[PDB]
Amino acid sequence: FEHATTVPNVPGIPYKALVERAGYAPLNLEITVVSSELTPSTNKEYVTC
Amino acid sequence: NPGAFGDIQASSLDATDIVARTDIRLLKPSVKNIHVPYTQAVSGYEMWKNNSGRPLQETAPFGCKIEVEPLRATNCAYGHIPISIDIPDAAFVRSSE
Amino acid sequence: KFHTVVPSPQVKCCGSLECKASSKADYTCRVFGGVYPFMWGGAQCFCDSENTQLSEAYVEFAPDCTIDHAVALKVHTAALKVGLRIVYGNTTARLDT
Amino acid sequence: ITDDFTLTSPYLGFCPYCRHSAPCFSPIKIENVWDESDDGSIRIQVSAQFGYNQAGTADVTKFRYMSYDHDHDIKEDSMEKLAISTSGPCRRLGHKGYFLLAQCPPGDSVTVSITSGASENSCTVEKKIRRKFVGREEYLFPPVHGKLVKCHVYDHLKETSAGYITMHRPGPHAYKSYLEEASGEVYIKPPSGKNVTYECKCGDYSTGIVSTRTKMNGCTKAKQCIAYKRDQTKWVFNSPDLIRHTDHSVQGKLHIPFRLTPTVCPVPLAHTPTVTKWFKGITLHLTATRPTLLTTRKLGLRADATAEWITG
Amino acid sequence: PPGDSVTVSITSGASENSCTVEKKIRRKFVGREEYLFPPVHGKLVKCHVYDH
Amino acid sequence: NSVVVSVLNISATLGSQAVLPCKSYRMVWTQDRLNDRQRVVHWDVYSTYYGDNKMERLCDMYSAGDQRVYSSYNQGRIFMPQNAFTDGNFSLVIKDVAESDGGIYSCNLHHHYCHLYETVKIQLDVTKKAKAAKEYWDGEKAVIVALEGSTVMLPCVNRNQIWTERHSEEEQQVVHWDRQPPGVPHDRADRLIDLYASGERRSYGPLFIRQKMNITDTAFALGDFSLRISELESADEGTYSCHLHHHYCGLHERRIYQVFVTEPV
Amino acid sequence: NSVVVSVLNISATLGSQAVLPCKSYRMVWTQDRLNDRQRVVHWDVYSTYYGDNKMERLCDMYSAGDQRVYSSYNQGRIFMPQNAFTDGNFSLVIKDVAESDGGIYSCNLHHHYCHLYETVKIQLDVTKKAKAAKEYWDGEKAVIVALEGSTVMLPCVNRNQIWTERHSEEEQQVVHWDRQPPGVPHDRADRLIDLYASGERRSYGPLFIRQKMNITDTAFALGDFSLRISELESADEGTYSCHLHHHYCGLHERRIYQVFVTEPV
Numbered sequence A: 001f002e003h004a005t006t007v008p009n010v011p012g013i014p015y016k017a018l019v020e021r022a023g024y025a026p027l028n029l030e031i032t033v034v035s036s037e038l039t040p041s042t043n044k045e046y047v048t049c
Numbered sequence B: 001n002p003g004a005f006g007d008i009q010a011s012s013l014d015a016t017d018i019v020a021r022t023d024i025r026l027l028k029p030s031v032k033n034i035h036v037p038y039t040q041a042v043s044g045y046e047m048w049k050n051n052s053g054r055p056l057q058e059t060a061p062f063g064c065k066i067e068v069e070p071l072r073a074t075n076c077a078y079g080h081i082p083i084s085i086d087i088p089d090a091a092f093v094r095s096s097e
Numbered sequence C: 001k002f003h004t005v006v007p008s009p010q011v012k013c014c015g016s017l018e019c020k021a022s023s024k025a026d027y028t029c030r031v032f033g034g035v036y037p038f039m040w041g042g043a044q045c046f047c048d049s050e051n052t053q054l055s056e057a058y059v060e061f062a063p064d065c066t067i068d069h070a071v072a073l074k075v076h077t078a079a080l081k082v083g084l085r086i087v088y089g090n091t092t093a094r095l096d097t
Numbered sequence D: 001i002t003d004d005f006t007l008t009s010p011y012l013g014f015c016p017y018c019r020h021s022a023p024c025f026s027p028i029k030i031e032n033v034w035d036e037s038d039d040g041s042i043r044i045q046v047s048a049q050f051g052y053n054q055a056g057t058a059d060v061t062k063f064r065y066m067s068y069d070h071d072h073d074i075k076e077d078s079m080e081k082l083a084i085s086t087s088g089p090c091r092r093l094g095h096k097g098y099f100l101l102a103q104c105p106p107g108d109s110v111t112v113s114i115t116s117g118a119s120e121n122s123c124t125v126e127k128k129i130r131r132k133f134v135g136r137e138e139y140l141f142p143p144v145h146g147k148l149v150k151c152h153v154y155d156h157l158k159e160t161s162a163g164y165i166t167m168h169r170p171g172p173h174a175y176k177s178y179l180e181e182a183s184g185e186v187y188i189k190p191p192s193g194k195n196v197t198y199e200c201k202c203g204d205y206s207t208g209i210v211s212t213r214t215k216m217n218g219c220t221k222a223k224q225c226i227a228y229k230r231d232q233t234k235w236v237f238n239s240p241d242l243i244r245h246t247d248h249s250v251q252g253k254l255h256i257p258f259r260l261t262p263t264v265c266p267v268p269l270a271h272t273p274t275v276t277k278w279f280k281g282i283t284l285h286l287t288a289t290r291p292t293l294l295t296t297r298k299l300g301l302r303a304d305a306t307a308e309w310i311t312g
Numbered sequence E: 001p002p003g004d005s006v007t008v009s010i011t012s013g014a015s016e017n018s019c020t021v022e023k024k025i026r027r028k029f030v031g032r033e034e035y036l037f038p039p040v041h042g043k044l045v046k047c048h049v050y051d052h
Numbered sequence F, G: 001n002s003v004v005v006s007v008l009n010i011s012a013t014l015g016s017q018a019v020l021p022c023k024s025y026r027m028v029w030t031q032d033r034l035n036d037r038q039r040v041v042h043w044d045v046y047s048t049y050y051g052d053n054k055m056e057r058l059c060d061m062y063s064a065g066d067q068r069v070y071s072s073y074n075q076g077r078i079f080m081p082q083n084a085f086t087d088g089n090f091s092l093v094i095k096d097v098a099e100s101d102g103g104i105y106s107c108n109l110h111h112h113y114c115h116l117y118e119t120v121k122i123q124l125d126v127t128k129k130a131k132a133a134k135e136y137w138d139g140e141k142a143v144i145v146a147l148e149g150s151t152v153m154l155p156c157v158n159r160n161q162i163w164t165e166r167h168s169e170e171e172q173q174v175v176h177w178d179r180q181p182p183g184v185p186h187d188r189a190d191r192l193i194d195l196y197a198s199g200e201r202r203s204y205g206p207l208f209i210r211q212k213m214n215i216t217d218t219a220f221a222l223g224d225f226s227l228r229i230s231e232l233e234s235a236d237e238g239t240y241s242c243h244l245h246h247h248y249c250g251l252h253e254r255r256i257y258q259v260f261v262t263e264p265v
């Protein structure tokens, strides 16, 4: 099954949610953003020294 | 995405590490001899090749002449350019002569 | 364009076995019991349909790819280079900026 | 890694086609084919080996030799008795190790046949082969005169610098003639002068080794025992028709012959059209004999891309 | 394979005699897909053939 | 003090050529102008739980380098105390352990310049009940059992002088070929020739014997310090000793050959 | 037909070892699996008018390649007919010539595989008056004088079979060491050994003489086809010939050595 949820951008902040399906016990779902990795695209221009 | 351009992707041409998904499903043995029947979708590279459309060389506005090794255009004309030219004083000639 | 890998299947005779994944890209694996192994040499091994076989496959770029490679490029910040030739006092000078 | 070829031996395969138009086994099994060359050169891979001497022979290199395997043994033969056909006779461009290069007109399937003097064995595989040419016009054959452009073709020189093919030792093999069960009690008759192993499972996984010996086993049923002529000497390739050994360990590599290379190629120069007169326009009396690609586009802001194919 | 006519010829060592007749011969297959050649794996169905 | 690698009796024949094979490709000296001055350690887990059942490297420490985690998750989970690089306690810490995390761990040390590497093996297991959570030592490996998600420690300490920081000036690896004079007991030889890591060679005694005492010009590089003595004379009779010492790597070895001149027969 | 590179009299001594130095580093065979299959030509001007007075490369054609101009201006100014690559007329065209453009031109050919290169020198001058605008030939160079801004042509044609396209299959460079039997005139030798570019060697005659007829195993690669004959016998007496032919480069040469067995003195 597929479930949608919004989470803050932050580490060490577990977020808990449930999924509702008839005849199925609500299933605990824990989501943790372990870390972030912002990697941009860059080009080498020149060097100096 | 099976049956699409860039189905097989790699960081470099000779990269040992690769990632791909093209919907391969195994079939159960169904004959006398030992055999492995495999079913898979058509390769996406030839797919994009068949109906890739016309090349950019026939679509560039202003007739840009595109070269690949720099991936750059040349001999393409559009727009205006303001410029400032500095000329040495010695190059000038007095009106007396 | 890629090529599927069709390695020699694993056969466990009159016993059991379990599937294992592989780091190869787009890998697939699956077991099958009640196999019916035969070959020119004949029934590879013997047990009253108890034997089973594991099959698996993956994909790899074909050698032709070495020269048939197509690269996906992300581009930005177009920069223009202009070559100017300036004549002054019947003297010709050049620049590229 | 190395490039030696005497360390491997040809292996059997299962061709969907045979001389009886039905699937069956043969040493001429073919699994892969490539047609990316601009000239149309075709690379064919076969289970058997040629272009070198028979595996395990005193000499290793012999063009005329044709190594194959049957009746539990490998042997040589003359390569001149080998033919290839897709829609007719095909010409041989070269052969090396497992692979070969040829060039012949298109069709729908590729067949390779060999006559043993008294018997003929043929194996073929379906493949979409269609003639193609470079340039803006799809002509019939390259002309004597025209422009020169870049193209890609498979070199006709044995030396190759592309590709990489694995190579590993073979797995076990099976036979019936090793086991005879005319009487109620089991009987095993391995070929003379050959070490052999045998296995049976009644009661326990009991195996026995015979060095030109007939060793009996307790359990009676014919199905109840198998034999191996294990040699584990000549390496084999990973093919579906073969059986993996328990080790499943790589042992070496080999090069695929006749690598692709760029090279100059010719292309035709079409009959240049005649430019006519038209106010705020142009009428062109285009003349051609074969299909050709025409295109044009406005040089202004609007691309106005136009492309078309012209037959006559 | 199919074609448009069928020819039978015999060479007498020094002379050859050939006779042919036109006929519409087109390859056909059973099932819901007209393939090129029967595959190694697939379903099994009934068909009609001339015994050898 | 060096240690006798091996003692061999050499029946050198008068007039002919004798060879003493004292050499070691481990002793090979780096050819490039930048001799390696760095060493590496790393941790790698081989968990058969994975269907891929491959070995994956958790992290690695580079001498005088910066801690770098191979993946994006082991940061925080994996703790490798930087100061421990001096202590040599190359231990590993896991914050939370999952059923897919248990398996086989290996702590490995590699050094290009000294060409010395080591590996130590450990086992990790996880159980839902802490009752069975108890370490044990198998002699060839150690098995760890701990509750899921519980912090666990895996020790990897070698307590070796080479693997701990020592910015000692790179003393040239001394090599000495010294021959005991005729009728002289061992350990009383006079240096026939001396070889330095820099490539300079100090010759002792006559020059003609040194020329006939052929030694490959790249011995300091290749490490082929084997001594080839030609046109054997009675003066050359006596035991030979090949001593090698590397201060930076701390190696010290000696090879003794009982070289006695024997007349042709 | 080969050409006698040189004839030398060899006073081979019986029992000793003789050396025939037939070899050429030009004949060296490429080691990499991808033997070079391309050739290059280029034009370069050395105009002392520039204060920098350096040589600058106008353009270069690569076999089976695409025309590429080093700078952004020579395009249009420099015209190198593509078809001329087959014709070999590697001429250059200037649309307009400036006072700073006149100087010294050089047309150069380089080929890595054959290791053959050539250079031809020309002079260009510009004058305001067309009266003095006239070419002349100095034997060692040609001088061009033309009006400023006038289109000018500089010819560079070699008319050589090697430098014109020939997609001939790469025949192995045949090398033959053939010895004239004792008391036999030249050109009547029987091949003692044959060497192919692929590295395969065909031996003829006894195997012991071939083993003593030491030839470096990398001769096909290094090109050191020099023949070292050891334990000379009276049978080995006779003239030796070292023939080399390269079909792709078209080279054909032979070296003759008058090898006569002489008793020790």
Ligand SMILES: *[C@@H]1O[C@H](CO)[C@@H](O)[C@H](O)[C@H]1NC(C)=O
Residues within 6 Å of the ligand: D193, D194, D195, D210, D211, D212
């Ligand atoms: C079978 O192999 C064993 C093991 O080396 C050997 O002793 C025996 O002679 C062999 N018998 C044969 C090859 O017939």
